Design an enzyme around this catalytic site. Structure first.
Site, mmCIF file in Angstrom:
data_model
loop_
_atom_site.group_PDB
_atom_site.id
_atom_site.type_symbol
_atom_site.label_atom_id
_atom_site.label_comp_id
_atom_site.label_asym_id
_atom_site.label_seq_id
_atom_site.Cartn_x
_atom_site.Cartn_y
_atom_site.Cartn_z
ATOM 1 N N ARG A 60 -8.289 -32.106 27.732
ATOM 2 C CA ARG A 60 -9.495 -32.843 27.439
ATOM 3 C C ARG A 60 -9.343 -33.632 26.200
ATOM 4 O O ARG A 60 -8.706 -33.187 25.243
ATOM 5 C CB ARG A 60 -10.627 -31.941 27.180
ATOM 6 C CG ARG A 60 -11.412 -31.439 28.316
ATOM 7 C CD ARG A 60 -12.178 -30.421 27.584
ATOM 8 N NE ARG A 60 -13.301 -29.863 28.249
ATOM 9 C CZ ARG A 60 -13.954 -28.780 27.822
ATOM 10 N NH1 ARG A 60 -13.585 -28.074 26.755
ATOM 11 N NH2 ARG A 60 -14.973 -28.359 28.526
ATOM 12 N N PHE A 65 -14.979 -35.393 18.553
ATOM 13 C CA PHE A 65 -15.059 -33.972 18.718
ATOM 14 C C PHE A 65 -13.622 -33.372 18.645
ATOM 15 O O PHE A 65 -13.120 -33.148 17.539
ATOM 16 C CB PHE A 65 -15.836 -33.645 19.996
ATOM 17 C CG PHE A 65 -15.996 -32.206 20.215
ATOM 18 C CD1 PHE A 65 -16.511 -31.407 19.214
ATOM 19 C CD2 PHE A 65 -15.571 -31.621 21.416
ATOM 20 C CE1 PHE A 65 -16.633 -30.031 19.403
ATOM 21 C CE2 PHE A 65 -15.666 -30.230 21.622
ATOM 22 C CZ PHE A 65 -16.220 -29.434 20.634
ATOM 23 N N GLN A 68 -7.971 -31.265 23.187
ATOM 24 C CA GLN A 68 -7.748 -29.874 23.548
ATOM 25 C C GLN A 68 -6.478 -29.753 24.409
ATOM 26 O O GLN A 68 -6.240 -30.610 25.264
ATOM 27 C CB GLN A 68 -8.966 -29.374 24.271
ATOM 28 C CG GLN A 68 -8.810 -28.080 24.904
ATOM 29 C CD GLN A 68 -10.153 -27.480 25.358
ATOM 30 O OE1 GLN A 68 -11.165 -28.103 25.310
ATOM 31 N NE2 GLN A 68 -10.120 -26.241 25.801
ATOM 32 N N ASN A 107 -10.921 -20.920 23.187
ATOM 33 C CA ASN A 107 -11.080 -19.549 23.615
ATOM 34 C C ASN A 107 -12.260 -19.407 24.585
ATOM 35 O O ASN A 107 -12.814 -20.437 25.011
ATOM 36 C CB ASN A 107 -11.253 -18.664 22.388
ATOM 37 C CG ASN A 107 -12.552 -18.905 21.678
ATOM 38 O OD1 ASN A 107 -13.608 -19.036 22.314
ATOM 39 N ND2 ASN A 107 -12.504 -18.948 20.343
ATOM 40 N N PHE A 118 -7.398 -26.626 19.840
ATOM 41 C CA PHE A 118 -7.880 -27.997 19.651
ATOM 42 C C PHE A 118 -7.197 -28.591 18.461
ATOM 43 O O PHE A 118 -6.749 -27.839 17.597
ATOM 44 C CB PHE A 118 -9.305 -28.059 19.124
ATOM 45 C CG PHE A 118 -10.213 -27.152 19.727
ATOM 46 C CD1 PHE A 118 -10.591 -27.324 21.105
ATOM 47 C CD2 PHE A 118 -10.796 -26.164 18.940
ATOM 48 C CE1 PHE A 118 -11.551 -26.454 21.769
ATOM 49 C CE2 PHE A 118 -11.747 -25.297 19.532
ATOM 50 C CZ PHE A 118 -12.141 -25.454 20.985
ATOM 51 N N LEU A 127 -18.417 -25.075 14.789
ATOM 52 C CA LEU A 127 -17.304 -24.209 15.277
ATOM 53 C C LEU A 127 -16.880 -23.135 14.268
ATOM 54 O O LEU A 127 -16.228 -22.161 14.659
ATOM 55 C CB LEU A 127 -16.078 -25.042 15.644
ATOM 56 C CG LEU A 127 -16.304 -26.117 16.697
ATOM 57 C CD1 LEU A 127 -15.035 -26.902 16.984
ATOM 58 C CD2 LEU A 127 -16.895 -25.459 17.952
ATOM 59 N N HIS A 131 -13.999 -20.125 16.058
ATOM 60 C CA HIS A 131 -12.623 -20.495 16.386
ATOM 61 C C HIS A 131 -11.677 -20.305 15.192
ATOM 62 O O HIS A 131 -12.036 -20.627 14.024
ATOM 63 C CB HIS A 131 -12.577 -21.939 16.848
ATOM 64 C CG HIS A 131 -13.424 -22.192 18.049
ATOM 65 N ND1 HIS A 131 -12.943 -22.061 19.335
ATOM 66 C CD2 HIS A 131 -14.738 -22.516 18.165
ATOM 67 C CE1 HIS A 131 -13.920 -22.320 20.190
ATOM 68 N NE2 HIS A 131 -15.019 -22.590 19.506
HETATM 69 CL CL LIG Z 1 -13.022 -24.723 25.810
HETATM 70 CL CL LIG Z 2 -17.393 -28.224 30.302
#
Ligand SMILES: [Cl-]
Ligand SMILES: [Cl-]
Ligand SMILES: [Cl-]
Ligand SMILES: [Cl-]
Ligand SMILES: [Cl-]
Length: 169
Positions: A60, A65, A68, A107, A118, A127, A131
């Site tokens: 992603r 943001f 990933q 996670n 990420f 976050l 994380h």
């Molecule tokens: Cl995720």
């Molecule tokens: Cl999603």
């Protein structure tokens, strides 16, 4: 091997401090935070070295943001750790998601780390505490920006593959 963890906690920064990641969009370098996140760094470093991330994708990419990655299946559902299936968070009051370039474990809720992580693209205080921050991009943020510029589908997958070719130490 929890001896290996306790050792690299201390010696990590000077004996195995940096990893170079080669992608099809260029190369960047990360700096590992061994002291604060020794279990998480040992996993990442070991996975890198044995070629586990070779030819895996950033499944992603969401501008402002995160990018990933770290799933050998490419689906967002897979991944494994050097410890077996999942391992604990290492949350540190000293490390927060304060800017772009920070590497943090992806996670499924508390203590479900495996190999997905990420790279942040902006401050993300929401976050902090959920994380494990364990490294940051130490050379060539441009590469991270190039990756974030690539078009994506409505579920945020890049329209062509963006991949880690290999890792260097
Ligand atoms: Cl995720
Ligand atoms: Cl999603
Ligand atoms: Cl360190
Ligand atoms: Cl962005
Ligand atoms: Cl930022």
């Amino acid at each position: 091997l929890e001896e290996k963890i306790a050792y690299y906690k201390m010696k990590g920064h000077t004996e195995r401090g940096y990893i170079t990641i080669y992608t099809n969009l260029g190369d960047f370098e990360v700096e590992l935070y061994w002291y604060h996140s020794p279990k998480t760094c040992l996993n990442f470093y070991t996975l890198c070295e044995m070629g586990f991330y070779d030819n895996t994708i950033f499944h992603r990419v969401i501008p402002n943001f995160v990018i990933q990655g770290g799933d050998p299946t490419g689906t967002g559902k897979g991944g494994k750790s050097i410890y077996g299936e999942y391992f604990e968070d290492e949350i540190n009051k000293e490390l927060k998601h304060t800017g772009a370039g920070i590497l943090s474990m992806s996670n499924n809720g508390p203590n479900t780390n495996s190999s997905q992580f990420f790279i942040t693209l902006a401050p993300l205080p929401h976050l902090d505490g959920k994380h494990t921050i364990f490294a940051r991009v130490s050379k060539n943020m441009t590469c991270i920006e190039n990756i974030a510029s690539v078009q994506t589908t409505a579920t945020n997958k890049p329209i062509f593959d963006l991949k880690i070719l290999r890792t260097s130490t």
